[PDB]
Symmetry: C3
Subunit: 474 residues, 3 copies
Amino acid sequence: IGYHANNSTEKVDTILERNVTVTHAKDILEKTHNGKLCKLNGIPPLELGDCSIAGWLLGNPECDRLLSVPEWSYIMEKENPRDGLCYPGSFNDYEELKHLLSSVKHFEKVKILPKDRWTQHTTTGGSRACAVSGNPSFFRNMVWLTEKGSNYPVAKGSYNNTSGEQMLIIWGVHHPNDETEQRTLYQNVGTYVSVGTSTLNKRSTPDIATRPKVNGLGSRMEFSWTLLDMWDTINFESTGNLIAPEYGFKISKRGSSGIMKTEGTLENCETKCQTPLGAINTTLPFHNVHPLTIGECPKYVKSEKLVLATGLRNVPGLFGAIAGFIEGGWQGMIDGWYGYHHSNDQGSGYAADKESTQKAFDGITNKVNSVIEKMNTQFEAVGKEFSNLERRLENLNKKMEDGFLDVWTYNAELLVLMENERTLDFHDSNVKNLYDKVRMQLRDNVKELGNGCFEFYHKCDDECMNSVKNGTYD
Amino acid sequence: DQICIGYHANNSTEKVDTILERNVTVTHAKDILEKTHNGKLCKLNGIPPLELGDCSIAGWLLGNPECDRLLSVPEWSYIMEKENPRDGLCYPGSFNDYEELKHLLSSVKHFEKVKILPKDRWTQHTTTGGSRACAVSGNPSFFRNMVWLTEKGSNYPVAKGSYNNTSGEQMLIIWGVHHPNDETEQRTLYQNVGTYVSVGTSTLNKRSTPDIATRPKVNGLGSRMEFSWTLLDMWDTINFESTGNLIAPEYGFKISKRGSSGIMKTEGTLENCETKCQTPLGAINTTLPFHNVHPLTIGECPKYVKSEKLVLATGLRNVPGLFGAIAGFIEGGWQGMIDGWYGYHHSNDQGSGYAADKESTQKAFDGITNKVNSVIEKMNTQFEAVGKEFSNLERRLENLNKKMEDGFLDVWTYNAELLVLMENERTLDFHDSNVKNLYDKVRMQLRDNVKELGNGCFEFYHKCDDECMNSVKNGTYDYPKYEEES
Amino acid sequence: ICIGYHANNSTEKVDTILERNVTVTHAKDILEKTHNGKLCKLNGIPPLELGDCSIAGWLLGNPECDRLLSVPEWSYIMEKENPRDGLCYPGSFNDYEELKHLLSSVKHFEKVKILPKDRWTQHTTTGGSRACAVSGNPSFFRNMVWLTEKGSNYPVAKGSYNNTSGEQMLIIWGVHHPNDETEQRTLYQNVGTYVSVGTSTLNKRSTPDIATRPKVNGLGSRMEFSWTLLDMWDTINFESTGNLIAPEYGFKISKRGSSGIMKTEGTLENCETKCQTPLGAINTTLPFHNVHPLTIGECPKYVKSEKLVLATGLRNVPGLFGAIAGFIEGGWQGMIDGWYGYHHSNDQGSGYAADKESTQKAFDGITNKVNSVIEKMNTQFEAVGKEFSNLERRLENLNKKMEDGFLDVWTYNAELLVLMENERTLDFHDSNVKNLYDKVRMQLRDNVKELGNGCFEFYHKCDDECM
């Protein structure tokens, strides 16, 4: 009676030993990507290229050559894009807006307050900070309302959202550098910008103050945004300083996702799980490619290897058989894990025991499937956006992401160490029972050598052997 | 004459899973997953929930007239609110830090409405302002708890009102600012045009100005009322001052908490049962470590888990393993044995029978009882609310909460599933070992005086009466005899 | 010759999954529960000791905070729960909690004068108040300037500063909210005033909120402070027609790594640690601790356990494999060379001789088990104790629910890991003995009578050479 051995050099670790050589193994740690940024469940990412979401939505001219898909599953944005607010300013609840737009089932720009209908006001206001070909220009999607021939009548504009979808609408307030600038632009001095819906009520006043120049400008534009419900109306009214929308964005979501910081470009592959380094195609329970994934991914883990033993100890244990009283394995056996040798005056040979091998194999298959398929895997974004005044909130997020990282790493490491010493012991027991099963038949008619062999007292031809390996014999 | 070592079997069809096998039939099992509720919404630790019925918390606190018929308890342990109540801000508006206020009120040790700035004392101002958006019987009315200060006969003198909190408890006080639809409305209501509303305490400093703008009509109104709130400490004073547009409180709410809880979205009503753990589907009464009833629980509950079954094997493999005994060289089990898990058969010229081995059965039973108790009682279970409130501009914060709740869900589910799979293969193996040792314990006594058949039976060479058997099952036995030999 | 196992005077108890209060020959506690009682340096760098002050009081320069130490560098902040000296002049501080997090850990911190008090000619500059009194006399936040009318005139106040210090600079300013319109005038002449602050990033125009309030420290007025980080080479511009409480100083700040604040009454003591708690410092390699939840540094997983004892030796007898406390009824106190071994009775003498090879292997295995449980534990720098405002009760609870969530995960897992690993360990020893017995039996065979107690009685004579 003996056990299998081969040319393998695959090493695993158990709870009691390490660097233990086994005959076969399974790695349950995915660590390879494809290097490519891909579609996610068949739907592409929004490719911003060199733009920020602000620049894109406002219509920074340097963002004219963007692709713009009707639908996307996540957003590729560079870390520190180049083209954002060409006209220096700020964007209120910018991060909230990014989350909103992270994943969109349908997205269509539509004209809601046409530039031309602003008669009684100058409409061509631009600036060289938004220059296209030396010439002054402006956010393609916004209108800079300024005095007309020395007069700025109350500006009123409204829009009933009849597009049949929620609509994202953005507006701005211009903050002059000094009182003089305020006048040459708007005539009036104590101005206001007023925005209303069923939900939104807001009246801003310009904050005229002295500031350092950004892109050569001391003035600023502060943008705000809102979701106009279906069949609801938005009302703009202003005595000056209103930067009005010309367009709105029909938006229907969906499921919500996240933004991926990367320099690379979309490549036309598929994936259910994307990382900033490349896409992951795996059934394995854990990965260590990169923490900031998007999609349905394995548990990220701080391990370098998680190798599960599946075969037995390779010898060229709890039950004292394998590498025990049966000193070594048989390379000559290839039909299975456990089996017989048998020496006869009709010839020698190695014959695997198909029934106990098959059972052991079913068990190990079940173990590996348990460790792999009990793992619940849902869609997550991981990489989140936080402002400069949200350092506590950002850290709460980190402490949380790190918290799970440690839980999964420790558990996966130990699950593998514990399950490996069980597996080797399992093989040991399988052999010990095969030996005992044969011993309990032969009894007296054989001398138990002690090396796992039985020397027959009587002659045992090829017909007699088969009975022993069968369970027949007598 | 012969004696046989064996193990219990029964009519059971209960199946469990191990790490190596599945759908394995065992003689007894324990389900450690609670999945039944009582369908009722109950008191929580003896204290009722606040039943809002068709109202929102805003509607309730402000005194929306459609909320007149609410119960109002002095004390509650959580709040039942519908998803999308019907009666909130009858006069269209907003409520600042509304969600924070809901959390504050989620659980309250004592709650009493008290009159702090009596409506009548506002002489020099009109006080009867109402609106048909808050209509009670066609007629115009208003939030029962608030006062709409308006011009009196073409005059709106500065309005001053203060209150020293002498109630001996923190007091929740709410006020509002009215945002007219146009400048004309502003005048016919308040005369003055550049108005303000000013509120102060030792802690709060706020001056609002009305935002007069054009808006779509909600409940037929283009105007809006924006409410704010604060906690007035004990022995501290609140000062209101305004040249117009103040919607002043008439009442305040004595509030003493407590512990903080949460709000439950449901359509159902309180039913007068008890529970330590409430779900939107019904209450849970269990000692089990895990449940799968519903994620949004309130109280002290089992770990919610995405499993369908978590069955722990306690008995042995039902046969009608690591140690090669059970369903091994002892091919099957004995249905005829009912005194225990392991035991003897024995064939005598005085009769046959089955006799369980009380000492090894009792030990095995104590071990399995300890295993099950370990898995169950090591589970730490504290009071939590789970269901949280987030505003429209708090989608990131809400998602952080979800990612967190989902994070633990996966941890517990994976661990519970595997803990059960691992512990089950140990249990079956444990029984196997128990039998193997009982067999070996008998073999090592008899030695020569018996032929080891190989099926777990021993055929005696000498005769072994009922007195001889007892010695073998005792551990006595010996042996001088001998015969045979002969 | 016999086969048996070790026993000793030990009374150390462990629990397994099947039994409890089981006595073993040796054990290892993997739960750290001792501190040194001292508050210490953290990785060689001291904490900022605020003593009786709040961070506001410190930064603004509340006079009652004059005698503070002030280090150029610190790894965390000691602040009392409810300090005594904060805003002596009643008010508020905007995004205060965010500011505390910013300052929790600082690589370099230097106060520098950016808008000298003297250069405010055309304005009165000596404004004080008895709420900030130093020796009866009125005083004011040492780091701030109270700009007031000069002889009945308050010209537009302009002051700017280009950040040339070569480091980000934390700058703080305030707006004074008078009690009534009259106070506004006797302080600033003008009535419709504003305070305006600008940088490349910050744009803000505040107006004073004149209203009636209860007195705090005898004052109905209030000062509302705000703050900003002025980037390197960027400029900040102040402009105001009144009510501006201007900075005289700014704080060069370079961080670092970010940490947290520790609420405590104690004082720094000049010890070292990698892990500090409010009760004392922890020096351990153990995977879990139960000293205190609010730690700072690199600490073991906090856990709700009272004991986590790992069995390492075998069952102490004065199992799965039926040997230990089985057919070999008890252990030998007379054996001291190892865990398993032989007795042997000879006509040349008796004795106990441990089996060095199987003992050494078992010992290597158990050493590996204990090392696995301990060294697989990933331990990173965390702060745990966080600051939340009165209007952040939801956010604070999200943090608690999270901290409690992991506490339960680790506690349950550590408890069960120990229970499961202990029944494996005892069984491991059992198997080791069973195999040593079988290894000897399979040699002797016929030449000996197997007694059944783990001994073999030789048929032939077996001298010391035969043994």
